[PDB]
Structure 1
Amino acid sequence: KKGSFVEMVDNLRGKSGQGYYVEMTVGSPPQTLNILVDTGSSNFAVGAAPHPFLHRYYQRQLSSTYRDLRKGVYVPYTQGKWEGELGTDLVSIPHGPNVTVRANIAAITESDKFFINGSNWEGILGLAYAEIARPDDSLEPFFDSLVKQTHVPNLFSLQLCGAASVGGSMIIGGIDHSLYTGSLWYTPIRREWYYEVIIVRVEINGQDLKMDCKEYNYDKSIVDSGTTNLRLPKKVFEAAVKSIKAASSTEKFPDGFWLGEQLVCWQAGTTPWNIFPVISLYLMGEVTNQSFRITILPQQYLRPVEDDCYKFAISQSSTGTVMGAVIMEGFYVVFDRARKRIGFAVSACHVHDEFRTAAVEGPFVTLDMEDCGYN
């Protein structure tokens, strides 16, 4: 094992809609577990007690390197939650860098709507910053430990691929140039808590929504591999849905389809992709008055579920914009913590369309970009 980037290519798996996971080991001797990759939280936590949905769990008693921190912890996500006991142990990523680190681990003893029946993961790796860690920001997140204890550079990249089985790559400590095409375009990380960014403009089929750009970032915009959907603030959501409805009005949809509560189905291979618009999100750039855009295909926001059946993967939010897994899919996303920026490029595993392509394009000029941030 060398820790070379090729060794990390294709190291992610998942079941559709159930999250992307990476293989990790905890303890001595090493206990193998599959771990959800979550850029939207900052705690490393594993099942540590039997649960109807867990096929295996962390057995602290069998680890000679386990150290109790004698402190309890709970984490409330949007719907799911867990509580457990804090400890430290030795952690490796088999298809990752050739290193072992001692990291904080929350041993989950009780949970509510957290684990998923048949997901094949037993834990969560929160890759965001200490500021949002529980119980508080003194609990050092895994990636901070990794960088502090080793020579692994302070960055990682994610290539989330489509299809049902899903796959992808987490390149730890760098950028693998075989995984994307064209140029990487970078947006600043506004604040190190969530991976917070600033959207400066939104277009749907080349037509500007013409909203006050503050609305796009009310009350924040984040990049979150642990959230499935594109989530949009109420006002933006309504404008977007009105526009997508009108673009696709030649077709008949249930009312609860647009709410994400119903499926729409078409005769296998007759999905009318052309009637659903592309969405362009413009992100603040690296230089003065400069931005770039990422363009989202309808194949990203109509999520296939088991004729071809789809859920609407844009949902209303009262907690800000979330660029979830459906947005990240078909892009190569670089979380360059070292230079406080997030990079985007067209992925090698790009989502196909007959006549359109997901794109990352620039430079664009955009005045008063700082006004777009919510305060």
Structure 2
Amino acid sequence: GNTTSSVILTNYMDTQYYGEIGIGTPPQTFKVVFDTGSSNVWVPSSKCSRLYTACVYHKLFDASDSSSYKHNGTELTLRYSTGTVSGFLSQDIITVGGITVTQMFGEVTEMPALPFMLAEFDGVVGMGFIEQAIGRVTPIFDNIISQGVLKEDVFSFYYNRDSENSQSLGGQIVLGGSDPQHYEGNFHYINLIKTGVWQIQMKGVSVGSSTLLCEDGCLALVDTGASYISGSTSSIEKLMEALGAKKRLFDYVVKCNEGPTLPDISFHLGGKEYTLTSADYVFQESYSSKKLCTLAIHAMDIPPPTGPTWALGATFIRKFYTEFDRRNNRIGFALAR
């Protein structure tokens, strides 16, 4: 077995990254987020009523136009930090890359306007473990591993920084390996705490020189479906004070002129310092002192058993190419380029 597939990703404003999959024969394509913090695959269903304006605005899967579709109809409900989708299970072949696998996924027939009217993508391909899958549906990567087609039992993420270029690649996911065009040096591997969750230990978070946060250790989820870095309300309040940031309704901001001279924030992982500077974490839409600029960091209280935990989302992954290694239960980071 020696295949390594690769899916190009569109980068929308540094907050949503999504690629295409095809479902059925002939394929119906969908825009989907590849999410290490969840484990189910779903797309909107042709059976989704118009009453759901999010189903009006996205691509719908029509079972009856595919010959490889296999009925199941068991009910499915998925709860995310953003809201809940609901529908039922269907089997069909899914193409990502590269690779064709037979999969159980959700056809979604309830999709709330909040917040899917803001989703540039249609559905989600969860990349987490079966342990976290609702209905214990076998996850796509498990089904792929079963095929024995992959060079190595790993996948990795490159997320680029938004750009004005017509060209210039938003991001890329590799299945089976990592792409040395988008990282320098070698991977520093850190071991999962346990199989079941893409989560490692974190020994501290510092702002400036001082170990401000997580001073006695804490957890970090490595969450490719998260836009920002997240911590618990209690940590984030502390961090945001340190930066002089202001809490608004949807974000934290600073005066744009102040952004560039804000302290670095470092994350202490597997014995090393992973530093994002204020250029990595302020959306500097101008440098005016009369404007407010958003930070790519916010509070999310992730409930037990998976939290309390930080999550290292795109703000972090932009700087560090990330490889998810299911064979050895570990995560590798190297500098992205």
Identity %: 24
Amino acid at match of 1:106: G
Residues 98-153 of structure 1: per-residue CA shift (max 9 Å, x gap): x3110111100112246633644211010000111112x3x101110111124113
Give, as a single letter, the amino acid of the residue that structure 1 aligns with 2:240. Answer: V
The farther-off stretch of 50-59 and 315-324 is: 50-59
Q: Calculate the aligned-residue CA RMSD, in Å.
A: 2.5
- The runs of 5 or more residues in structure 1 that have no matched partner are 246-252, 285-290, 349-375
Quickly say closer, same or farther: Cα 1:155–1:119, change in 2 above 3 A. Answer: same
Paired with 1:70 and 1:211, the residues of 2 have a C-alpha distance of 45
Aligned counterpart, 1:162: 161
Aligned 8 A contact 2:82 2:115 in 1: no
2:206 — aligned with what?
203
Query: What is the deviation of 1:14?
Result: 3.0
CA contact (8 A) 1:73 1:86 kept: yes
Instruction: Specify the alignment match of 2:305 in structure 1.
Output: none
Partner residue, 1:256: 247
State whether structure 2 residue 295 is matched by structure 1 residue 312.
Answer: yes
Q: What does 1:113-152 align with in structure 2 at a 5 Å threshold?
A: 113=113, 116-117=116-117, 119-135=119-135, 137=136, 139-152=137-150
Contact 2:230 2:300 in 1 (8 A): yes
**1:230 matched to 2:229:** yes
After superposition, the Cα gap between the structure-2 partners of 1:238 and 1:272, relative to the gap in structure 1 and judged at 3 Å, is closer
TM-score by length of 1: 0.77
Distance, in Å, in 1 between the alignment partners of 2:334 and 2:196 is 23
**Structure 2: tracts of 5 or more residues without a match:** 303-308
**1:282 pairs with 2:265:** no
On the 8 A contact 1:181/1:345 being kept in 2, the answer is yes
Question: Which of 65, 70, 79 pairs up with 1:76?
Answer: 79
Where do 1:347-366 residues align within 5 Å? 347-348=336-337
Query: Which runs of structure 1 show a deviation greater than 6 angstroms over 4 or more consecutive aligned residues?
Result: 305-308
Question: 2:306 corresponds to which residue?
Answer: none
1:333 to 318, 322, 334: 322
Q: Does 1:21 align with 2:12?
A: no
The letter for the 1-side match of 2:35 is: D
Counterpart of 2:145, as a letter, is V
CA apart distance, 1:172: 0.9
Distance 1:59-1:311 versus aligned 2 partners, 3 A rule: same
1:158-192 Cα offsets, whole Å, 9 max, x none, are 01111177711101110111111122111111122
Shift of the 35–264 alpha-carbon distance from structure 1 to 2, 3 Å rule, reads same
| CA distance in 2 between partners of 1:92 and 1:230 (Å) | 30
Amino acid at match of 1:22: G
Matched residue, 2:28: 31
Contact 2:12 2:162 (8 Å CA) reproduced: no
TM-score (norm. length: structure 2)? 0.85
Q: Give the equivalent residue in structure 2 for 1:346.
A: 335
Contact persistence 1:263–1:310 (CA under 8 A): yes
Distance in 1 between the 2:263 and 2:113 partners?
34
- The structural deviation recorded for 1:4 is 5.5
Amino acid at match of 2:331: I
Find the aligned partners of 2:83 and 2:189 in 1 and give their Cα distance.
Answer: 32
Pick one of 274, 291, 297 that aligns with 2:277: 297
**Deviation readout 1:11-35 (Å, 9 max, x if unpaired):** 0003225521111100011111111
| 1:366 corresponding residue in structure 2 | none
Amino acid at match of 1:154: D
In the aligned structure 2, how far is the partner of 1:65 from the partner of 1:73? 21
Map 1:260-271; keep pairs closer than 5 Å: 260-261=250-251, 264=254, 266=256, 271=257
* Alpha carbons 1:19, 1:37 under 8 Å: kept: no
| 1:182-223 Cα deviation digits (max 9, x unpaired) | 221111111223311100122222222275424x33xxx201
2:174 matches 1:171:
yes
Decide which of 38, 42, 67 is 2:70's aligned counterpart: 67
The residue type equivalent to 2:71 in the other structure is D
